[PDB]
Amino acid sequence: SKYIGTGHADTTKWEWLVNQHRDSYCSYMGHFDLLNYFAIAENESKARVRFNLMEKMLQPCGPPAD
Amino acid sequence: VEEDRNTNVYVSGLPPDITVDEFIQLMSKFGIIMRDPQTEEFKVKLYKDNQGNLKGDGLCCYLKRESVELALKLLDEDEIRGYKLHVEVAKFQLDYKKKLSMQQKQLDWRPERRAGRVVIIKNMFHPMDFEDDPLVLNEIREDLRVECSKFGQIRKLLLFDRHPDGVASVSFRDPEEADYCIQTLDGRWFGGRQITAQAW
Amino acid sequence: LLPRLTPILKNRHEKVQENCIDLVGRIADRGAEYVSAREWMRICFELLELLKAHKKAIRRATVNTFGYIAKAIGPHDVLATLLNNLKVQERQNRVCTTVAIAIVAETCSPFTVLPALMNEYRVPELNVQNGVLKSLSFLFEYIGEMGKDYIYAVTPLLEDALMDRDLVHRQTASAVVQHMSLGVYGFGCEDSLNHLLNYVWPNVFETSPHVIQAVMGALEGLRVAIGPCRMLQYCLQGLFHPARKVRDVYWKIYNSIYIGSQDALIAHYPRIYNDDKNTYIRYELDYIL
Amino acid sequence: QDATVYVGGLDEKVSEPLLWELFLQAGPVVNTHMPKDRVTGQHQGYGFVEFLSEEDADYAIKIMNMIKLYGKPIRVNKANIFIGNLDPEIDEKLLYDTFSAFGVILQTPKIMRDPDTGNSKGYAFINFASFDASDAAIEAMNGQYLCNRPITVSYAFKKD
Amino acid sequence: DLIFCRKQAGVAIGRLCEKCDGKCVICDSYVRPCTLVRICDECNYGSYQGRCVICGGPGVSDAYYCKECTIQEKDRDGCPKIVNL
Amino acid sequence: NRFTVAELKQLVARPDVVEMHDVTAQDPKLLVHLKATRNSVPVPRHWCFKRKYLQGKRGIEKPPFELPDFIKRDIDYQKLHDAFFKWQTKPKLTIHGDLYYEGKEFEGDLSDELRISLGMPVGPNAHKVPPPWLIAMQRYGPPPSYPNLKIPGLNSPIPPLYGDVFGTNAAEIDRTPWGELE
RNA sequence: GCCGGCUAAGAUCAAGUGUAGUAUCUGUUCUUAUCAGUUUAAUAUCUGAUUCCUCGAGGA
Numbered sequence A: 001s002k003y004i005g006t007g008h009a010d011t012t013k014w015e016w017l018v019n020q021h022r023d024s025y026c027s028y029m030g031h032f033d034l035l036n037y038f039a040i041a042e043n044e045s046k047a048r049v050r051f052n053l054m055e056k057m058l059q060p061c062g063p064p065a066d
Numbered sequence B: 001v002e003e004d005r006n007t008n009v010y011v012s013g014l015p016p017d018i019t020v021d022e023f024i025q026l027m028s029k030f031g032i033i034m035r036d037p038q039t040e041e042f043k044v045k046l047y048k049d050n051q052g053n054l055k056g057d058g059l060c061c062y063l064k065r066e067s068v069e070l071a072l073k074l075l076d077e078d079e080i081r082g083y084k085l086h087v088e089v090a091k092f093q094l095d096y097k098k099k100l101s102m103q104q105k106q107l108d109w110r111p112e113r114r115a116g117r118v119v120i121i122k123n124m125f126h127p128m129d130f131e132d133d134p135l136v137l138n139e140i141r142e143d144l145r146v147e148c149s150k151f152g153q154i155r156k157l158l159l160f161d162r163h164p165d166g167v168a169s170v171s172f173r174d175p176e177e178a179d180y181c182i183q184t185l186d187g188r189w190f191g192g193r194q195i196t197a198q199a200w
Numbered sequence C: 001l002l003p004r005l006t007p008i009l010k011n012r013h014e015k016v017q018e019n020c021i022d023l024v025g026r027i028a029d030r031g032a033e034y035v036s037a038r039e040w041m042r043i044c045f046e047l048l049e050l051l052k053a054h055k056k057a058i059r060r061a062t063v064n065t066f067g068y069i070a071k072a073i074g075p076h077d078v079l080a081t082l083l084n085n086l087k088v089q090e091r092q093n094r095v096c097t098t099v100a101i102a103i104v105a106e107t108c109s110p111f112t113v114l115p116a117l118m119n120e121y122r123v124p125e126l127n128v129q130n131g132v133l134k135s136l137s138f139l140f141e142y143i144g145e146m147g148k149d150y151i152y153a154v155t156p157l158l159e160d161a162l163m164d165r166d167l168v169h170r171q172t173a174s175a176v177v178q179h180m181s182l183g184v185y186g187f188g189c190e191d192s193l194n195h196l197l198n199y200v201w202p203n204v205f206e207t208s209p210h211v212i213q214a215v216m217g218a219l220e221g222l223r224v225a226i227g228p229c230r231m232l233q234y235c236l237q238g239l240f241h242p243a244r245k246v247r248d249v250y251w252k253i254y255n256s257i258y259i260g261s262q263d264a265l266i267a268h269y270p271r272i273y274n275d276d277k278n279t280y281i282r283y284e285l286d287y288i289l
Numbered sequence D: 001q002d003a004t005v006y007v008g009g010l011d012e013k014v015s016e017p018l019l020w021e022l023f024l025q026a027g028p029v030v031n032t033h034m035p036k037d038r039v040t041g042q043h044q045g046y047g048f049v050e051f052l053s054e055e056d057a058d059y060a061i062k063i064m065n066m067i068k069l070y071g072k073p074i075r076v077n078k079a080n081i082f083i084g085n086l087d088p089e090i091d092e093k094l095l096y097d098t099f100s101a102f103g104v105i106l107q108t109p110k111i112m113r114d115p116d117t118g119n120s121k122g123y124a125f126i127n128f129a130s131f132d133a134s135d136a137a138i139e140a141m142n143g144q145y146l147c148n149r150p151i152t153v154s155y156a157f158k159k160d
Numbered sequence E: 001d002l003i004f005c006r007k008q009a010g011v012a013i014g015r016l017c018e019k020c021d022g023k024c025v026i027c028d029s030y031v032r033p034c035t036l037v038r039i040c041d042e043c044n045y046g047s048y049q050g051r052c053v054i055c056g057g058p059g060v061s062d063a064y065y066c067k068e069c070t071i072q073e074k075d076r077d078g079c080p081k082i083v084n085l
Numbered sequence F: 001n002r003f004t005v006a007e008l009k010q011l012v013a014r015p016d017v018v019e020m021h022d023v024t025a026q027d028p029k030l031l032v033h034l035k036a037t038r039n040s041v042p043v044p045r046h047w048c049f050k051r052k053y054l055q056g057k058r059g060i061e062k063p064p065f066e067l068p069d070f071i072k073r074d075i076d077y078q079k080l081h082d083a084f085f086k087w088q089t090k091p092k093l094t095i096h097g098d099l100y101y102e103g104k105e106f107e108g109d110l111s112d113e114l115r116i117s118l119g120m121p122v123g124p125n126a127h128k129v130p131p132p133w134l135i136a137m138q139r140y141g142p143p144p145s146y147p148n149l150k151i152p153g154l155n156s157p158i159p160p161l162y163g164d165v166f167g168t169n170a171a172e173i174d175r176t177p178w179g180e181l182e
Numbered sequence G: 001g002c003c004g005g006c007u008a009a010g011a012u013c014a015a016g017u018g019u020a021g022u023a024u025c026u027g028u029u030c031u032u033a034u035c036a037g038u039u040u041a042a043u044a045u046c047u048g049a050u051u052c053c054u055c056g057a058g059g060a
């Protein structure tokens, strides 16, 4: 429960999906050749891709329900 | 008729200063010794002369036959400090299920570990009632003992006559009987006052 | 020297015991052909009780000397005697017998111990099969990497024990699965381990604490030996079940899988489509250079 | 029932995969069924072979008819005198033609069938015109060599 | 009340007593000790300086994780000292 | 304010994975979608039962343990070790998604024994010895169910026939694996 | 288990015995009934309401 990203019987789809999006972005920031792949694919500098991922970290999957 | 399935072993020759405990240690080194179901005292016999004199022969029955064949190939022709023993399948010439199953359960492989039995009763008496009545405390102790005897075997029972809350301790042999006594004593009335019970 | 030496093994001083055991070990290692095998058998059966010593040096020397004596006189007779002793004794002596069987199987290759041990599981009587299962558990835990050649031989026995109604059978089979999984890792034994997971998994709905503890241990061993992708594949359909019991069990298993190897799970998550309100597709992984 | 062929006259050497292996050359036999007895726990000589198409079952019934399999008259079919141990390859018209040589038959004969398969039970009942044909069947046909099956003709009811 | 401490572990080495000398602190195994145990600073202070991590008696030798616990990275949690409340 | 089974079956791409209780979930659309992932074995099926996962029927009474063939064929030297590692075979194994449950334990060529019991002689060198089912095939014609089957005498020559092989199916690359030990 | 059923398919409430732990046994009862609320994946559970026939009695 103290670890961030764990769930329980009341976990919703939104929390699950934002958790996997957030650690996906962190894994992209960590691994050197995944960021290379993305920066070649979208034709940007690697610093720009890193900053874009950090900016996307705040609200991935949009704002929550109700 | 029973050719094999003989769990009795015959120890030919022994030191004439043999005690029963050294012998049952010698025999327990090779497995579990069957115990007489009605009683204690493992089924071990020291054959004796017309007097206290020790003939030097011994009988021992085992729970299983594999322990007999163990004693056959490990005790035969082996020396205790002074003498040379001889081991042979015993010769004979001329309640039940309960304890049988218990001795069997002595070979279990059940899970161990786990957590690894005293009930405290309060608000039962007062020190002010025992100042002008020397026989009320003994009658209250006898009533508490008669109440604790119905739930299980009470091993120790004490009553604090100098405690202002009326503390009493009942220590039984099993924690289930103490839990049953704490469940049957909680909320009950004793002497016009509501007494409480807790575990220890 | 040796028949004069064997009564000193029962002395109760620690230095005397350690030095006597070391001396008997050296003698058995180099001068094994000078004393009969019957006396060696008696000495090993006496050493059996020293595996319970409160001191670590006594246990270390006893393990060494037992290995030497077993290497000397041969595995067959000592293994027969150890199985007989495992059948008839109290708990601590049976545990020491299990340790001794594992030692014999490590010094003399487990090929020499496994057939006789599996032949004892054929006895139609409980408390004998459970002893065989405990011995197999400790054997695999003790031999570790050497077990990669013997997983195919014990798989049907573990199947049988996992289909059994007895609870100790399934708990001990789960312990065996865990030790076997952590023993072979990086050696390409995933087929048998997936096969055995197919029999371990139905026990997740068990209320008995010891059984569920052993099942969790086996699952965390298979997480290492088999990989987190398979575990996530086993958890996906239960993560959002309508019943709260299924959800509790599956989220416990999932949290255990998530705390270890959080990074690998990035490559294993299934695709989840966008709804009207929220975006769920990870688009970067769809790029194609 | 149309795609399945009922086989009768199987000995102890024939088994459940053996009939499917023998019927594999005739057609694609998908399954084989052998009903086990309650007292003996073995096959009663009659079984079924369910194929894929009805033409394969017709070819198996027209090819494996009155064959000598395991020393037994195996035959495939579409799934007061008493005759016992009769071959399942014969029909009611064949039994009426075989019984016409001894005496005259009053009507068409009937053969008993099993309640599960319905091909052949093992016994049959036939009625003659007079007692002379029954005596000729009990003298000559009671013990005659049939198609790899020793039949036995007896009287169904007799008054002392 | 057998609960691990689970605080940030420091530079202090865990100790075992004469009774627990060969044991693993987490799973209680005796086979293949692999990784040296580290404890936090509140477990290593003053009278607590040298003490068994399993029971709390006078330490005599180093505490170790087993190879099985090291493979599963169970040496990466906090202080493994058994603390009672 | 909850779907019905038929209503939810109309929304999902795969309706045959929908079940009775699936409409009672907190998020049935995600549940049904995960039930359709191209993997992910389902739940052990006895969660809703009331018999503690061990069925007390089906006659579980049976032999204790059948050792493998390699088990049967000092105690044995390195030569019998050689035997145990030459005879060692891989047993039957189930693939990734085949969970166990209480019930799933019970549910032109002729053999020499059947040919010896049927009274058929062995194949000669150069002669015609057909089975008694081959005369009907020679009279009526070839079977339409297996047109590629060959029989000696009709389609196959007499000198073919060898041992117990009385028929052969004649149906009308670089298959070597790449990296393998020599 | 035997040839759909013979009430060994489940829950529960009191007491006894006993273990480190799991447990084991006896009396029971089992709503034969309806509605509303709680709750359960659904049951379950709990929380409340609800003259006639026969031979002085019994049943509904």
Ligand SMILES: CC[C@H](O)[C@@H](C)[C@H]1O[C@@H]1C[C@@](C)(O)/C=C/C=C(\C)[C@H]1OC(=O)C[C@H](O)CC[C@@](C)(O)[C@@H](OC(=O)N2CCN(C3CCCCCC3)CC2)/C=C/[C@@H]1C
Residues within 6 Å of the ligand: C051, C052, C053, C054, C056, C059, C060, C063, C095, C098, C099, C138, C142, C143, C144, E022, E030, E031, E032, E033
């Ligand atoms: C179910 C088993 C029981 O829990 C049992 C181990 C234990 O619980 C009982 C209590 C007691 C006191 O009777 C016994 C305890 C422990 C033992 C007998 C172990 O020995 C010791 O304590 C002495 C010391 O810790 C080291 C012993 C040692 C090196 O043999 C240890 O095993 C090993 O380290 N191994 C075994 C594996 N072996 C191979 C060889 C290749 C490379 C190294 C790893 C794999 C290397 C050496 C365990 C032995 C006894 C189980």
Ligand SMILES: [Zn+2]
Residues within 6 Å of the ligand: E024, E025, E026, E027, E028, E029, E065, E066, E067, E068, E069
């Ligand atoms: Zn460990």
Ligand SMILES: [Zn+2]
Residues within 6 Å of the ligand: E016, E017, E018, E019, E020, E052, E053, E054, E055, E056, E057
């Ligand atoms: Zn300690």
Ligand SMILES: [Zn+2]
Residues within 6 Å of the ligand: E005, E006, E007, E039, E040, E041, E042, E043, E079, E080, E081
């Ligand atoms: Zn700490």
